[PDB]
Design a protein around this ligand. Structure first.
Ligand SMILES: *[C@@H]1O[C@H](CO)[C@@H](O[C@@H]2O[C@H](CO)[C@@H](O)[C@H](O)[C@H]2NC(C)=O)[C@H](O)[C@H]1NC(C)=O
Lengths: 213, 220, 188
């Protein structure tokens, strides 16, 4: 019943910065607020219990505090081993409820993506389904809008996307949007386009091809 | 110091019953609540329920009385039962040391987790289709589309692991058909399209499937 | 002449544990065996004295302390126990010679959206003395920063409410508690 609003949803920072995430409780939960760290593949570990108390073995840069209604997890000098997703948990009133999380990602300079478009192979067309793949590579801002245009008709509801984690070297993301279409629908149209809107591009770039060429 | 070891089947069909068990080896088993937490793929954490040494249970109302949590005090174990499962119950299920009975703080120790996937799909090998570099370009891009497979995972290498730079294998995406779909991509110098060979190495252990696929520019 | 135990056990409203109610009892003729045998008490534990009614009709001043806590905290209403209730709300001395009675009251003290009327002290700078009762609503300073009676960062209101919903587990359901102490002037 109790809403736990966690802000911001995601945030960028660099090593050595001071970072505070906030968790806002719907009702007064007094001192029953826990903070957890969560990394891909790793079991979640508790960081703060009772709003302010530090779990044993957790470094001293991690701090916590609360008012009963507004809570705050703070990292003084950020380290590489702190880039993860942080969740708060209230246990003031049943049912216990979590926050949506705050993902802590590495800050770097703006990097425009490299866009590529891939028509469906003849081998796949023989099976009766067509897959058009658009690829965004090497971009720092996660914010990216990919729009499919089939003969200048904006396609929605048949496009599934996927994104990598921050690369361990250049700290960029890459994104694949796959448009799925039946063979009949595929052969009903000529121009297949992938339009990409990204902060690092002054104008939206469009990569396209013509069925058959 | 204190460790939790959990187990149970993680591959279920809908309407089946998930049954996980957690074993405690360390802290006094009586002075704590023992709880279950869930994390659906990319959807944050959700508290399922918990039980104390005396058998008192707190459940999350979100589960419509489908949850039953039991305790065995002579083996220091506690179990989770979730009936009438659907694909919405696909998640990683952890057991954890919940709240103590003195000052009521907890979630100290966690189980290693159990990956649970609820799908009426049968084991299927992937079809591998080429993503050819277009007649264009500096640097070029090519790859493979690994489609129609169940369950996870698939392992993709390039040239039998001879090339790793610029590779990007995207996390799988569950299609509306219940099968998984993935794409692996390489950026390579566009002056290497005629001299160097690029080949996908796709492995799907559940179906015992290996597919090698050569990726070349499509001739006009 | 028959004692007013009804007014305590049957009482329509019970007190928050931090502000526990204390009733004096004198000119009392009471059957204590009839209470000990009542299945309506899930908990009835006598430390030191033990259940017997031939003891002087009534002692000099029988005290009946009453309040509401949750299920998992009932074990704390006992000598030598440590916990949030025993540290901050209601303590019994080590030489306690009296009885502790408890019963589940989910049907009386639980609302569907949560009964927020029963509260307990959540913070205190020191442990209670036995039979101490603290009504202070002073803003508790959890951190190093003072509060100056203003809530805020590490600056809590010292009392927290129980949720008390009927759907709670038995450990988090309300339990009504009565503690009878016997002191020995004159004897009634
Ligand atoms: C609390 O209330 C109940 C019900 O009013 C009392 O139980 C009654 O006790 C008398 C004997 O004293 C019996 O003859 C009745 O049959 C009982 N009624 C029921 C339904 O149990 C109880 O005595 C009260 N508590 C105290 C201390 O008086």
């Amino acid at each position: 019943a109790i809403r736990m609003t966690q802000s911001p949803s995601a945030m960028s920072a660099s090593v050595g910065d001071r970072v505070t995430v906030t968790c806002r409780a719907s009702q007064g939960i007094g001192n029953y607020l826990a903070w957890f760290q969560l990394k891909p593949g790793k079991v979640p570990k508790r960081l703060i219990y009772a709003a302010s108390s530090l779990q044993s073995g957790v470094p001293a840069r991690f701090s916590g505090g609360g008012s009963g209604t507004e809570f705050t997890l703070t990292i003084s000098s950020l380290q590489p081993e702190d880039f993860a997703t942080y969740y708060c948990l209230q246990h003031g009133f049943l049912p216990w409820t979590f926050g949506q999380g705050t993902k802590l990602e590495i800050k770097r300079t703006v990097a425009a993506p490299s866009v590529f478009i891939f028509p469906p192979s003849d081998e796949q067309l023989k099976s009766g389904t067509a897959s058009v793949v658009c690829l965004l590579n090497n971009f720092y801002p996660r914010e990216a809008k990919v729009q499919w245009k089939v003969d200048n008709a904006l396609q929605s509801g048949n496009s599934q996307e996927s994104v990598t984690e921050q690369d361990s070297k250049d700290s960029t993301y890459s994104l694949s949007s796959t448009l799925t279409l039946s063979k009949a629908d595929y052969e009903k149209h000529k121009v297949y386009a992938c339009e990409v809107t990204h902060q690092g591009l002054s104008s939206p770039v469009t990569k396209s091809f013509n069925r058959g060429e | 110091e204190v460790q939790l070891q959990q187990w149970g089947a993680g591959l279920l069909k809908p309407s089946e019953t998930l049954s996980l068990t957690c074993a405690v080896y360390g802290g006094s088993f009586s002075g704590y609540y023992w709880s279950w937490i869930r994390q659906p793929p990319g959807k944050g954490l959700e508290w399922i329920g918990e039980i104390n040494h005396s058998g008192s249970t707190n459940y999350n109302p979100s589960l419509k009385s489908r949850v039953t949590i039991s305790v065995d005090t002579s083996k220091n174990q506690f179990s989770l039962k979730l009936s009438s499962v659907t694909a919405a119950d696909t998640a990683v299920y952890y057991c954890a040391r919940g709240w103590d009975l003195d000052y009521y703080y907890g979630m100290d120790v966690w189980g290693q987790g159990t990956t649970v996937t609820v799908s009426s799909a049968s084991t299927k090998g992937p079809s591998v289709f080429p993503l050819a570099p277009s007649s264009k370009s500096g640097t070029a891009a090519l790859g493979c589309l690994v489609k129609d497979y169940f369950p996870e995972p698939v392992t993709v290498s390039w040239n039998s692991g001879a090339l790793t730079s610029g590779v990007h294998t995207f996390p799988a995406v569950l299609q509306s058909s219940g099968l998984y779909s993935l794409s692996s991509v390489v950026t390579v110098p566009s002056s290497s399209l005629g001299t160097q060979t690029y080949i996908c190495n796709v492995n799907h252990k559940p179906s015992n499937t290996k597919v090698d696929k050569r990726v070349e520019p499509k001739s006009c | 002449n028959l004692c007013p135990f009804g007014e305590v056990f049957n009482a329509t409203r019970f007190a928050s544990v931090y502000a526990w109610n204390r009733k004096r009892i004198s000119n009392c003729v009471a059957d204590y065996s009839v209470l000990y045998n009542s299945a309506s008490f899930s908990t009835f534990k006598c430390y030191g004295v033990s259940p017997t009614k031939l003891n002087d009709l009534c002692f000099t001043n029988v005290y009946a302390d009453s309040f509401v806590i949750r299920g998992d905290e009932v074990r704390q209403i006992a000598p030598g126990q440590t916990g949030k209730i025993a540290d901050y709300n209601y303590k019994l001395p080590d030489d306690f010679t009296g009885c502790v009675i408890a019963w589940n009251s989910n049907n009386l003290d639980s609302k569907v959206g949560g009964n927020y009327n029963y509260l307990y002290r959540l913070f205190r700078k020191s442990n209670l003395k036995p039979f101490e009762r603290d009504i202070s609503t002073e803003i508790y300073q959890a951190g190093s920063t003072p509060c100056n009676g203003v809530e805020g960062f590490n600056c809590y209101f010292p009392l927290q409410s129980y949720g008390f919903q009927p759907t709670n587990g038995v450990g988090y359901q309300p339990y009504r508690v009565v503690v009878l102490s016997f002191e020995l002037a004159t004897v009634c």
